[PDB]
Structures are given as structure tokens and as C-alpha cells.
């Protein structure tokens, strides 16, 4: 009569690494590393993302004609740009503090596009029909949907001075532009002034602009430039524009809402009818594992990104069915 | 093994024992069979559960973390940001892999210790009433029925009950 003491064994082929010995076959184990995604752009906690599609932040905010017009009011959980972003700044120039603006939009949860300066009846005694071939829409010459090219009317450019009082109850992003003609001839032909100036002021913003005339290399067949500026108008505050030339006046501004957990990503995937708590540019992650090796860029509630190819923790015993 | 039981003096494992990590195999006149030890198995399960759950618990939920952009005159800030992301990534990869390795070693050692202690428990319950025939087995000097085997397993082995008979057979 005998009795024996022994331990469990099975057919498991799971392997783990230890400090003394790599590659140990064990009876039970647990994977801590998430390597699977669905390859889709999904909703984040029920909220659909803001896809810009063919355009980037600059093109979307400025109002590039080639972009498919978005609904007046939008709300999202994160913003998606495509690598195929061709449509942005269509008329050559510098976008001042564009990166900072992107960083500001990174915490924005929704926008309301509204008319801050109504076209017909805002800039009397001035032309508002100016277009360009650099911003071509459907073959013809056009211009930004949110901006307005103020030009001389009937041989004169009177010193205009308009204002707007923010009663939206939220931050109002206002964008405008300053034109820099290649020669003084065009300067006189457009704004009828050689000593023109633009003045934009709020309670905390204050800037003056002076046209710089010089011949420049052709960019999109344009020797002239156009610098773009922006500011965030506080609730209850007033913004004042005063110009006697070279002002690309605002027409549509943005009522912005602040949120948490948002961000801007560059993705190739397309939007599907799914929902997730974690999103990467490669796809969505549905997991409770602490680690993931899919992508460093994550939005929502995700596992920690690591370079590891394998993170398997042994729970069972050394498997010896021999 | 650090305790020399698993893959040690108990060379192999039992596929025949499917209801537990550690246990027994018996053979008497009534027949033979396996029987997992529920106490030690449950304790080990609890401990390792606590280990896994603590490893998972220590890693907090990674909230939204996206890249940032810089113009042509901000190369320093760009490289600084990159250095931050890279450094954190290195450190976390390191920590994860190392922690997994360490806890794996400790886990195998833990199982080894459990088996060893079980064997020593049985060896201490029995005495000169049985002999060690190696491979983690004991051969009785007396007749041990299913009730006797059960007394061995649930820790109530009556040594003086069989001491006389075992003394006679041991001679």
C-alpha cells in the first residue's frame, strides 16, 4: 500500500521567460500585453470624432472651398486628420501661432460656426467680391468661406472700423488675415493707400499690422503673401478691427466649448458604426490588459504603450507531463 | 527548482490529476487513484491571484496622450519633447519586462515550495509507519484503506492506531 505526493500537469504549450531560464513551458499563464486592434475609427464613449477628411486644421478653420462644408454646430471626442491632407492654406503666407492654435483645439469638444461680421452690411463703402485662383473651387476662382477680401470700391478705401461683442457665453475664436502685395502698383490698385495699416484689439489682445511690399518667389503662382492671425475672444469681451487697407476681414467665427480627453491624430482608418473606450490611429482597442504595443498615440482610457513583443506572466506550474 | 521538489526528487507532473495544482496518488487493496489537495491549491490560487491583480493595479489607466507640432524655428523644443516621450517609453518598457521576469521566477519558486511543504507534511504525519521509496512516494508498513488515506490527506493520520502493526512489519 502506497501514497504519493505530486503536482499538476497538462498539455499546455504556453511559454514564459524567467531571470534564470528563458522559454519555460507552464500549465497556466496570463497575457498582459495587448496586440490586437480592429483597424477601425470608432466612437469614444458614445461620441463620434471630428473627421476633416481632405483638409487639415488650417484649411478647415480658414474655410477652404475644396473642403466639404461641415454642419453649423459640431461636437466630437477627438479630431482626425489624414496623411492625404492636401487642402490647407491655399493662398501662400504664414499661419502665426498655428501650432499653439492646434494645441488649443486639442481641448475643444465642440464648435458653433456663426456670422460675426455679416457680409452685405458690415463693410459699407468697400468691395467684398475679391477672389483668387489660388483658392480655386470647381475650376473657378474663389476664396475662404470664413474670411472676406476687402477691396477698394469706386476709387477709394475709407478707413473702416468695426467691432463685435461676445454674448455667446463662451470663447469665440476669431480668425483674420493681412495681405502683402508683391508690388506697390497692386497695393494702390487694391487698397488705394501706400501707408495702410490694420489694428486688431480686445481686452487682452493688441496688435498692429503694416504691409510689407516686396517681390517674392512664386508659390501656387502667387508672388504676394497673406499672413493669418487668430485670437480667443473672452465671454463678454469686445473685439475691434480698424483698417485702411490690406485687411482680410473675418466673416465666420467659432463659438468653442471646452472638454477633456480630446486630441488630434493622423489616421488612415475609416469611420465605422462601432464604439470603444480606447482609440489609436491604427484602430480601436477593446481590452483590460495593462500594456499594449500597438501605438504610442492613444485617446481615451488605454493600456500603457511599451516596445515589448511579449509580456506573459506565469500563474500555473512548470508543465512536465514526462 | 529552488526547493528541489518540482523537477527535482519528484521528477514529473500528473496529467491524471486534473482538479488541482497539488495533490496525492494512492494505491491500496480497494484500488488506486488521484486526489487534489484543496487547501494548498486554494491558498496558492489566492496568492497568485493577488500577484496578478497587483501587477495590473500598479499600472494606471493611460489617458489621452497625443503628439504636438513645432515650426521650423522650434527644433530644440521638438527634440526635448521627443526626448521626454522616448525616455518615459524606455523606462516603462524596462519596468514591465523586468517585473514580469522577477515575478515569474518567484512564482515557479512558490509552487516548488508548496509541493515541498506538502511532501514534508505527509512525511511528518507518517513516521516509521511508512518508508520513503523516493519519487515523492511513501510505502506503508501497514494496511491503509480509503479512510486511512483520507486521514493522511486531511491531516488527521492516527499514528498510534497503526503503530503496532507497522512495528511488527518493519521488524
Amino acid at each position: 500500500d502506497t501514497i504519493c505526493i505530486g503536482y499538476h500537469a497538462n498539455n499546455s504549450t504556453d511559454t514564459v521567460d524567467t531571470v534564470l531560464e528563458k522559454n519555460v513551458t507552464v500549465t497556466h499563464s496570463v497575457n498582459l500585453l495587448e496586440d490586437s486592434h480592429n483597424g477601425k475609427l470608432c466612437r469614444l464613449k458614445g461620441i463620434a470624432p471630428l473627421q476633416l477628411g481632405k483638409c487639415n486644421i488650417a484649411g478647415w478653420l480658414l474655410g477652404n472651398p475644396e473642403c466639404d462644408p461641415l454642419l453649423p454646430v459640431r461636437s466630437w471626442s477627438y479630431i482626425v486628420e489624414t496623411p492625404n491632407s492636401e487642402n490647407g492654406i491655399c493662398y501662400p503666407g504664414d499661419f502665426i501661432d498655428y501650432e499653439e492654435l492646434r494645441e488649443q483645439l486639442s481641448s475643444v469638444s465642440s464648435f458653433e460656426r456663426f456670422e460675426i461680421f455679416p457680409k452685405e452690411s458690415s463693410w459699407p463703402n468697400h468691395n467684398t467680391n475679391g477672389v483668387t485662383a489660388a483658392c480655386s473651387h470647381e475650376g473657378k476662382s474663389s476664396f475662404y468661406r470664413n474670411l472676406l477680401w476687402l477691396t477698394e470700391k469706386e476709387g477709394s478705401y475709407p478707413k473702416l472700423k468695426n467691432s463685435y461683442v461676445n454674448k455667446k457665453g463662451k470663447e469665440v475664436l476669431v480668425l483674420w488675415g493681412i495681405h502683402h502685395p508683391p508690388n506697390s502698383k497692386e497695393q494702390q490698385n487694391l487698397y488705394q493707400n501706400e501707408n495702410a495699416y490694420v489694428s486688431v484689439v480686445t481686452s487682452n489682445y493688441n496688435r498692429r499690422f503694416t504691409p510689407e511690399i516686396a517681390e517674392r518667389p512664386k508659390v501656387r503662382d502667387q508672388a504676394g503673401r497673406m499672413n493669418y492671425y487668430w485670437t480667443l475672444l473672452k465671454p463678454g469681451d469686445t473685439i475691434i478691427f480698424e483698417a485702411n487697407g490690406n485687411l482680410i476681414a473675418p466673416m465666420y467665427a467659432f463659438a468653442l466649448s471646452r472638454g477633456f480627453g480630446s486630441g488630434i491624430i493622423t489616421s488612415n482608418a475609416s469611420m465605422h458604426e462601432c464604439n470603444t473606450k480606447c482609440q489609436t490611429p491604427l484602430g480601436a482597442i477593446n481590452s483590460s490588459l495593462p500594456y499594449q504595443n500597438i501605438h504610442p498615440v492613444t485617446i481615451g482610457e488605454c493600456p500603457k504603450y511599451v516596445r515589448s513583443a511579449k509580456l506573459r506572466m506565469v500563474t500555473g506550474l512548470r508543465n512536465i507531463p514526462s | 527548482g529552488l526547493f528541489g521538489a518540482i523537477a527535482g526528487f519528484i521528477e514529473g507532473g500528473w496529467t491524471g490529476m486534473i482538479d488541482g495544482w497539488y495533490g496525492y496518488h494512492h494505491q491500496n487493496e480497494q484500488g488506486s487513484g488521484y486526489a487534489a489537495d484543496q487547501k494548498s491549491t486554494q491558498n496558492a490560487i489566492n496568492g497568485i491571484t493577488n500577484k496578478v491583480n497587483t501587477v495590473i493595479e500598479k499600472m494606471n489607466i493611460q489617458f489621452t496622450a497625443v503628439g504636438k507640432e513645432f515650426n521650423k524655428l522650434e527644433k530644440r523644443m521638438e527634440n526635448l519633447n521627443k526626448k521626454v516621450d522616448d525616455g518615459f517609453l524606455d523606462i516603462w518598457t524596462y519596468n514591465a519586462e523586468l517585473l514580469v521576469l522577477l515575478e515569474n521566477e518567484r512564482t515557479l519558486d512558490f509552487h516548488d515550495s508548496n509541493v515541498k511543504n506538502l511532501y514534508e507534511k505527509v512525511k511528518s504525519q507518517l513516521k516509521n509507519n511508512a518508508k520513503e521509496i523516493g519519487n515523492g512516494c511513501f510505502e506503508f508498513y501497514h494496511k491503509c484503506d480509503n479512510e486511512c488515506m483520507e486521514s493522511v490527506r486531511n491531516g488527521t493520520y492516527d499514528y498510534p492506531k497503526y503503530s503496532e502493526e507497522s512495528k511488527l512489519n518493519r521488524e
Binding site: 497556466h28 496570463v30 500563474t315 500555473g316 | 482538479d19 488541482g20 487534489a36 484543496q38 491549491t41 486554494q42 490560487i45 497568485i48 491571484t49 496578478v52 491583480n53 495590473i56
Partner: peptide, 11 residues
């Protein structure tokens, strides 16, 4: 996490 490896474990 729970390790339901045996039926009589208590989870």
C-alpha cells in the same frame, strides 16, 4: 481578474 482553473475554487 479571477483564475477559474478548477471548479471548486472559491473566485
Amino acid at each position: 481578474x479571477a483564475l477559474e482553473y478548477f471548479e471548486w475554487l472559491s473566485x
